[PDB]
Symmetry: none
Subunit: 512 residues, 3 copies
C-alpha cells in the first residue's frame, strides 16, 4: 500500500517535520491581498485547452512568478553533492541507482506532453499500445502533444501544488471566508492522518463543509497548482494540523539533507519500497525522492518551487544503455513518423562512426548523437579532413546509443542519404538489413549550396565541431552529420525555410 509507505515515512521522518500553519495562512493571506484571481481564472482556462502554445506558457510563468513574489515559503536554488559520511558507500550506490530509475519514470511520464507521440498511419497494435501510454500519462500531422513550445525547459517546475495557493484560490474562487476554507482543510487533513481520503469521504465532508465541493476527486498529471485536485486539497490540509508527522511539512537544509535521505533508505529497505518502471503517477517514494533532490534548501512538498531551474536528478548528484535508459529511448522514438521522408548521415567511417543523425524535414524532428571511435589513428585523420571533433570532447557522450537507436528504428522505414554505401554498411553491421535506402546523388557543389544558410540558422544545435578542417591546403567548414542532413534536404527542395527543429532524443541521453 502506497499509504503504508507514507505512514512509514511519517514515523521515521517525524523529527524533520514542523508546525507550519501560521506560515501557510500568512502566505495565503498575501495571495488574497496581492494576486489577480482573474489571471488565476485565466490560467485555469488555458489548462483546460487540449493544445497549449508559448503564449499560454508565458501566462502560466508570469502568474507563477507573481505568486512566488508574494509568498515566504519558497525553495531556493541549491545544488547538493552527496559524499560518503552520514550516507554510506552502499547508500550512495542505492541512491544513484534510484535517481537513474526516477529520471526514466519522470521523463517517460512528462516529456511526451511536449515532445509528442506520433498517432497517424500505424498498425492496430502500435496505436493500441501508444493509446495505452497516452492514457496512463494524462494525455487525451498525426502527432499528439499538449505543449507546443520553442523551449520545453521552460515547462520545468511550473506545475507544483502549494498549500497557500490552494487555500487562497479556495477562499476567493469558492467565495467563502478564509476561516471556512481553513477548517474544511483541517477536517480533511485529520482524515489523512488515517487514510488516503477518497470520493466517498469527500462527499460526506462536503455535507458539513460545502467549500469542498470545488474539489475534483476523480489524477495529479497534466495539471497545475491552480487546479482543485484531491491531492492539492489533501496536501493543504496536512499543513493545517497541530502535529501529526505530516511528510508535507518537511523542511530540508544542507545540514539535514543527508540524514533525511538516510532515513528514507531505512524505510525503503524495511518495506521493499521501489521506483516504478512504469509511467504515470508517482508512488510515495518516487515522490519524496524527487521532491527532496530538487533542492537541499526549502520545503520539498509545499514551497513555491516555480523559480527553481533544473530537475531533481540534475540538482542532486552522487559523488551500454541500462534497462531504464532503453525504455526512455523507446518512448522518445514514438515521436518519429515512420512514413515520413527521413535523411540519415554520419561522420566517421561506417565501421567506426562517431556522429550520427537522422532528420525528418516535414515535422522537423531529428535524431543526433555521438560515439567514441575505436581506431584513434583514423579518427585524427577524419578530424583534420572531415569533422573537426576533438576526441576528448566525446568522453562526455553516452555510449551504446548506436545499436540502441538503430535497433529501435521503424520496420521498412525508407531512408534518404548522400553517402548511400556507408549508410547501408552501417545499418547491415547493426543487423538492420531490412531498411530501404534512397541514394540522392547530389554533386559536391550542389550538396553544399545551403551550407552557410544551414549553419547560420542552426549552429546552436551542435557544439562538437571545434577543429580546423582543411581540403588539399585551405580551411573549410567542418562536416556535421546533422547540418549535412539539413543542407541536403534544402538542396533537394531548392530552399531552406525558417523552422524550429525538435530533438527526438533527450539531451540527458546523448550526454552522460
Amino acid at each position: 500500500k502506497s499509504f503504508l509507505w507514507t505512514q512509514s515515512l511519517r514515523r521515521e521522518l517525524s523529527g524533520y517535520c514542523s508546525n507550519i500553519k501560521l506560515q501557510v495562512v500568512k502566505d495565503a493571506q498575501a495571495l488574497l491581498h496581492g494576486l489577480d484571481f482573474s489571471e488565476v481564472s485565466n490560467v485555469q482556462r488555458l489548462m483546460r485547452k487540449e493544445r497549449r502554445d508559448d503564449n499560454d506558457l508565458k501566462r502560466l510563468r508570469d502568474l507563477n512568478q507573481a505568486v512566488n513574489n508574494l509568498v515566504e515559503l519558497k525553495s531556493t536554488q541549491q545544488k547538493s553533492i552527496l559524499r560518503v559520511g552520514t550516507l554510506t558507500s552502499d547508500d550512495l550506490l542505492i541512491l544513484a541507482a534510484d535517481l537513474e530509475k526516477l529520471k526514466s519514470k519522470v521523463i517517460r511520464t512528462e516529456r511526451p506532453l511536449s515532445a509528442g507521440v506520433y498517432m497517424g498511419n500505424l498498425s492496430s497494435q502500435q496505436l493500441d499500445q501508444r493509446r495505452a501510454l497516452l492514457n496512463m500519462i494524462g494525455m487525451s500531422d498525426g502527432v499528439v502533444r499538449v505543449w507546443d513550445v520553442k523551449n520545453a525547459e521552460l515547462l520545468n517546475n511550473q506545475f507544483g501544488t502549494m498549500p497557500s495557493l490552494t487555500l487562497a484560490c479556495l477562499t476567493k474562487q469558492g467565495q467563502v471566508d478564509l476561516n471556512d476554507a481553513v477548517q474544511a482543510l483541517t477536517d480533511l487533513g485529520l482524515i489523512y492522518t488515517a487514510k488516503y481520503p477518497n470520493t466517498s469521504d469527500l462527499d460526506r465532508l462536503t455535507q458539513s463543509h460545502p467549500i469542498l465541493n470545488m474539489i475534483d476527486t476523480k489524477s495529479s498529471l497534466n495539471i497545475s497548482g491552480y487546479n482543485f485536485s484531491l491531492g492539492a486539497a489533501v496536501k493543504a490540509g496536512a499543513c493545517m494540523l497541530d502535529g501529526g508527522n505530516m511528510l508535507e511539512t518537511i523542511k530540508v537544509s544542507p545540514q539535514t539533507m543527508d540524514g533525511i535521505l538516510k532515513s528514507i533508505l531505512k524505510v525503503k529497505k524495511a518495506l521493499g519500497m521501489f521506483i516504478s518502471d512504469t509511467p504515470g503517477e508517482r508512488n510515495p517514494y518516487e515522490n519524496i525522492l524527487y521532491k527532496i533532490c530538487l533542492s537541499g534548501d526549502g520545503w520539498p512538498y509545499i514551497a513555491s518551487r516555480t523559480s527553481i531551474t533544473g530537475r531533481a536528478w540534475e540538482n542532486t548528484v552522487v559523488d551500454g544503455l541500462t534497462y531504464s535508459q532503453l525504455m526512455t529511448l523507446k518512448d522518445a522514438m514514438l515521436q518519429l513518423d515512420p512514413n515520413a521522408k527521413t535523411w540519415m548521415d554520419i561522420e566517421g567511417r561506417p565501421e567506426d562512426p562517431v556522429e550520427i543523425a537522422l532528420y525528418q524535414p516535414s515535422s522537423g524532428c531529428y535524431i543526433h548523437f555521438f560515439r567514441e571511435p575505436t581506431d584513434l589513428k583514423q579518427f585524427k585523420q577524419d578530424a583534420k579532413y572531415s569533422h573537426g571533433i576533438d576526441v576528448t570532447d566525446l568522453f562526455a557522450t553516452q555510449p551504446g546509443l548506436t545499436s540502441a537507436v538503430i535497433d529501435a528504428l521503424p520496420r521498412n522505414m525508407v531512408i534518404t542519404c548522400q553517402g548511400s554505401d556507408d549508410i547501408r554498411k552501417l545499418l547491415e553491421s547493426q543487423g538492420r538489413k531490412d531498411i530501404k535506402l534512397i541514394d540522392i546523388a547530389l554533386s559536391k557543389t550542389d550538396s553544399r549550396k545551403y551550407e552557410n544558410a544551414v549553419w547560420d540558422q542552426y549552429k546552436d544545435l551542435c557544439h562538437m565541431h571545434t577543429g580546423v578542417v582543411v581540403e588539399k591546403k585551405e580551411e573549410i567548414t567542418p562536416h556535421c552529420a546533422l547540418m549535412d542532413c539539413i543542407m541536403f534536404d534544402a538542396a533537394v527542395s531548392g530552399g531552406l525555410n525558417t523552422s524550429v527543429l525538435r530533438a527526438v532524443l533527450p539531451r540527458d541521453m546523448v550526454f552522460r
Copy 2:
C-alpha cells in the same frame, strides 16, 4: 491493533445487514429534544458521579430511561431466540454454546462486582494488590461496591449508549444547534472508517468543532451510562452519521436474519481467530457483537433503546443441540465478597459423605453461599427427605454439579467457621483437604436452636424453594430442615433476636443450570 482488524473484517462480512439510518437517528434525537426533561438528564449525571449509589438513585435512572424509551422509534423488542441446526450447522451451534458460556463469565465478572461488592478490608497486601487491580480494570464494613440495591436485576440493560440520546444531549446540554452536533459527529465517524478515533484525533477535531470538547476523552466504557459523554458514545453516534462504511452500529436483526448474522460472525471468527477473552474489563469487538446480537432477536443491537429488555444475552438467546473453567473463574471472583475475618456459620443437609445442600452465612454483612448436590446414596437420601430436608431428588436435577469441591476449595485460609454440632462440618471439610479451617461448636439445645424457626421462614422463605416433602418426627409433621434457614436461625438464637435484606454470594444461574 488486533481489534480494529476484527471490526473491519466484521464490517465487510456483514455489509448486507448494515443500513442507512442517519435520518432515523437524527429524528429520534429531535423527539428527545422536544419531549425530554434535560434537567433530569443533568440529575442522572449527578447520580452517576457519586461513588456509592442506592435504590432511589436506581429508580431515577430507570424512570428517565423509560422516558427516553417512550419517545424514541429505534427500540429493541423483547424476543427470545432458540438456535437450532439449519442455517447454523451442528458444529456452529457448539461453537456458539462454548462462546456464550465464556461471554457470560467475562461479562458477570466485569459487571457483577459493581453491585455484589469486593471485600477490601483486613487482607494481606498481596490480596489487596490483586483485588485492587481487578477493581481498576472494571471501573470501580470493608466492602467496595457502586450500587447498594435491593434487587440487582433491576440494573440489567439500563446503561447502554444510544446515538439519538448522545445527539440530543450534546445539542441541548452543549447549547449548540443540532446541525453543529451532527456535523461534528460526521467529521468523527469518517476517522472511524480507518482507525479507532483517539484523544489526539478528538483534540484536533475540537479546534474545528468546539461541541466535541464535551466528550470526556479519559473515560472508560465501564461504570457509565447513556447520559455520559464518553468517546465510545460519540464514535458510535458518529458511525451512524455516515450512511456508509459498513458500520456495525447500523445493523438491524430480525427473527428471519439472526441465524445468518450469527453465521457471518462465525465465519469471521474462524479467519482471524477472534475469541472471547477471559479478562474482565472492556468488551473486544467479537464479545461486544455477540452480546449485543444475542440480547434480542428483534431490533438494533448497538443503537436502539434496550432499557425495556429483561434478561441477559445468554438468557435471551439459547442453543438447542462439574464446573467449566469459565464458571470456576466466575466463582473465584464471586467469593471475593466474603469477609474472611467475620463470623461465618455453616450447615449442611445430607450426611457428610453425601451432602445434598450447603450453606454459609456471614450475619454482619448479610452475605450467604447456598447450593445443592445430587445424592450418590439414594436409599439414605430417601430416609433424609422423610425425616429432615423434604427435598425431592428430581428437583436436584436442575442444580449445578461440582460446587461443593469448588466452593470449599475457594474458602479463605484460616477462616473461622461456626456451627451447631461440628462433627458433620469437620468430616465434610477434611474430605476436601481443608484441615486449616478452625471450627466453633455452638451447642444449642434442640429447643433453643429452633426458637426463631418460625420467624426466620416468615422473613426468608423466598430464598429457598427446594423443600417440598412432608417431613415428620416419630408421627407429627414438622417444618423441613434447610441448611440456609438453619444458619440464620441458629445465629438468631445466639443473638437473642432476628430484620435485614440478605445478599447471595453465588449468582442463581451458577447454582442452577
Copy 3:
C-alpha cells in the same frame, strides 16, 4: 562509558592488583620451551572451520590441558558461598539479581553456538531478526559446535597473556623481547584509552610482530585478537587484568565492584554479545574464589560463574533466554507432543522432533493433590516432593513461544487440544495418530534402554493387579514415533532453566 567503567574499576580495585610481568613472562618461557606449536597451529585450523565436532573439541581440550600443565598462573576449583557480613543484606540482593541477569545474557550469547538456530523455511522477518542475532554473537540449523556434551565447551576459550606472548614469539618468529616491547607499548596506550584500529596500525609501523593481530566472540586463547593483545600488554606494565582473588579477598572485591556500579550506574545488559566491563568482571570473579580471574589458565575449572558463586512464573531474564532457546525448533518438521497429568492440571510435558532429535521437556506442580495421587499410582509414578525442585511458569511461557501454525502429532489428540486451547493456541493443528495400546508401546523397553538417563522423575511403583513401567511424556513421544516408524537427542531447554 566502557572505558570509564574500566578506569573506575581500576581505582577501587588497586589494592588487589600487583605487577605480575615476571610471572607472565616465566609462564610464556615455559610454553615456548614446553608446548607443541604445530598443535597450536592445528587448533587454529580447527577454529577456522564453520562446523566443529567432538574430535575438534578433544584437540582443543587436550591442547588446553597441555598449556595448563606448563604454567603457574592457574586458577583452581573454588566454590564461593556469599553470606551476610562484609557484603550487606542489600549487597547480596543486588549481586543475586545481577548474576541472574548475567546468566541470561551469557547463555543467550554462547549457548546458540552448540544448541543451534533454525535458519530454514521461515518468514522474511524471522530470518532478518535471527540473522541480527547470529551476527551479534559472532555466528536448516546453524551451529558451530556439534558435540555430544556441551558442558565440555565450558571454560575452554579464555585468553591468557602468557599464551598470547608465547604464540606471538614462536608463530610470528620474533625474539621474546621484541613481543614484550611491542605488547608493552600497547599496554601504555591502554592506560588512557582502549587502543583502536588506528593505534595498532601506528604501532605496527615500528613493531612488526603486531601485524599478527586481526571480537572476543567465538574465538579461543590461540587466537590473535586485539583483546588478547591488550590484555597481555596490560600485564607488561592499576590494571584490572592483574587482580588476584582469594577466599579471604572475595567478599571485599565484590563490595568494591558494587560501589563502582552504584556510583556509575553500571548494569548487566539484556543484549547478547560482547560483555561490557561489568558483566566481564562479575563473570570472571565469580568463576573461582582462588586465582587470577582475567589472566590465569581457567581451562581445568568446571561450572559457570553463576554455579561457582552462590548467594546465601519466569523472571524477565529467563523469559528472554527461553524465547531464544525456542528458535532451535524447526516449525515445519514433524513434532510429537505428550503430557502426564490431566489437560487442566499437567505435571509433565514433552515435545520431540524426530528428524533433528531436539525435544522440549519440563514439569509443573499439581494443583489437585488428590487426583495427582491416582495418576501416580496408575500412570506417571512421580513423587510430588521431587517437583518442588522444578521451575514453575514454563507451561505458559513454552506454549506461548510455540511457532505459529504448527502441526503437532500426538496419541489421542483430545488432551493436547484442551491444553493448547486453554493457553490460547487455537492455530496449532493436531494429527491424532490412533495407535492401539499394544501397538503404541511396542518400543517401550527399547526407548527406555536408549534413553533412561534423560528423565529421573519416575520413582513410584505403577500398577494396572500387576507392576508396569511408569509413563513418561518424553519417552512416549519417542516410542510413539518409533511405532509409526517401524523402528527406533538435544534438549531445547537449558537444564538449569527446567529446574531451579
